[PDB]
Amino acid sequence: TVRKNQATLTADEKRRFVAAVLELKRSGRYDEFVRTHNEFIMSDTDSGERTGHRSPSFLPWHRRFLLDFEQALQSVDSSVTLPYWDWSADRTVRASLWAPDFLGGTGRSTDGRVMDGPFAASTGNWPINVRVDSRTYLRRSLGGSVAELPTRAEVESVLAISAYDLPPYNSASEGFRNHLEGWRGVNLHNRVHVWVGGQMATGVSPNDPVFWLHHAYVDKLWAEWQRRHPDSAYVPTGGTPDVVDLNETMKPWNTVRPADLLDHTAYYTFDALEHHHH
Amino acid sequence: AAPESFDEVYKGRRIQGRPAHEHGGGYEVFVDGVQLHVMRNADGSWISVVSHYDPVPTPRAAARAAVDELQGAPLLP
Ligand SMILES: [Cu+2]
Ligand SMILES: [Cu+2]
Ligand SMILES: [Cu+2]
Ligand SMILES: [Cu+2]
Structure with a gap:
């Protein structure tokens, strides 16, 4: 129940993570996470109902979505947890992240196809099934x-x-x-999706396993923010049309509220998280 | 107040736009006759399902960005 920086995983941890992800893909379970995510990002709108994105529940919703995915991984291999990618530190394509023993590298320039790693189309083990266009191979343009x-x-x-x-x-x-999230300012989370390119830049972005590592670090920054601001908490706190208030439940689960997800330590801890310091 | 319609051939592909498990609506875009889901942000900028994290100023810009992203590939409905 410890989420670790990807750059620190051992060879055995990388191997077990990859195998668990591939088994979720083989069994059909993976693609349904891709589909859930796409349905919410296509329905969440600034002027209407918004739950997964572009709204305060962006953070608890992705926290619970990642917990569902981690729990599915752990049903295949209980030792596996989601690692996180600190893209502020590991910021080039020669990061170990992108090595053939982990996620593989960038796509070739003709069609963006990823040519190495366990998720390259040529392995036969990573068909892109939930898609917005006919291409059935993983693409990136780091x-x-x-x-x-x-x-x-x-x-x-x-x-x-x-x-x-x-x-x-x-x-x-x-x-x-x-x-x-990135819609205003220097832009953190949205710009990382754009930087990876390929399916990661689209609504069907969980097709790339790096999705989980990116959102695990976004989720860690929420935890870091909480420690910096012990006097700040989720808002809004009631009665807001179209938006998930603190004690309102969230789709698709319907049985959990932002309030139930503010404290990550109920579910996992990080390898390192600085204490409230001054 | 919706954007104007458009119709052009961009990098060999026909892109069109017109006011009108996905969202509400307002405006429709097509790439070679296949609808491209697009969405407007509060600040007036647009995204699409092939570039969902990268706002561009207009629906034609979103259509063009989709053509660039697709590299000749047909969209799926
Ligand atoms: Cu998302
Ligand atoms: Cu995201
Ligand atoms: Cu203090
Ligand atoms: Cu829609």
């Missing part, structure tokens, strides 16, 4: 559509924002949630 991943300095500017979220609770909002 650093193609945007030059740079966020820097640590940029991350620290966002962590410094004290308010969790602010009306109108959407992509136009000031505050921590929307700056971490």
Whole structure:
């Protein structure tokens, strides 16, 4: 129940993570996570109902979505937890992340096809089934559509924002949630999806296993923000149309509230998380 | 107040737009006659299902970005 920085995994941990992901794919379970995510990002809208994205519940929703996926991994191999990718530190394509023993590298320039690693189409083990176009192979263009991943300095500017979220609770909002999501400001989470390219830049972005590692680090930054701002908490706290309030339940599960997900330590801890310090 | 319609051939593909498990609506885009799901953000910018994290100013820009992303591939409905 410890989530570790990907750069620190041992060879056995990398191997067991990859095998568990591939078994979820083989059994059909993986693709349904891809489909759930796509349905929410295509339905979440700034002027109407919004739950998974562009809204305060962006963070607890992805927290619970990753917990569902981690629990499915652990049904295959109980030793496996989600690692996280600190893209502020591991910011080039020669990061161990992108090695053939882990996620494989960038796509070739003719068609963006990933040619190595366990998820390359040529293995026969990673068909892209849930898709928005006919291509059935994993694609990436690392650093193609945007030059740079966020820097640590940029991350620290966002962590410094004290308010969790602010009306109108959407992509136009000031505050921590929307700056971490990326629709305003220096842009953290959205820009990483754009930087990877390929399916990671689309609504069917969980087709790339790096999705989980990116969101695991986004989720760790929420935890880091909480420790920086012990006096700040989720908002809104009641009666807001179209938005998940603190004690309201969230689709698709319907049985869990943002309130049940604010404290990650109920479910996992990190290899390292600095204490509230001054 | 919706954007104007458009119709052009972009990098060999026909892109069209018109005011109108996915969202509500407002505006429709097509790439070679296949509908491209697009969405408007509060600030007036647009995204699409093939570039869902990268706002562009107009629906034609979103159509063009989809053509660039697809590299000749047909969209699926
Ligand atoms: Cu998402
Ligand atoms: Cu995301
Ligand atoms: Cu203090
Ligand atoms: Cu829609």
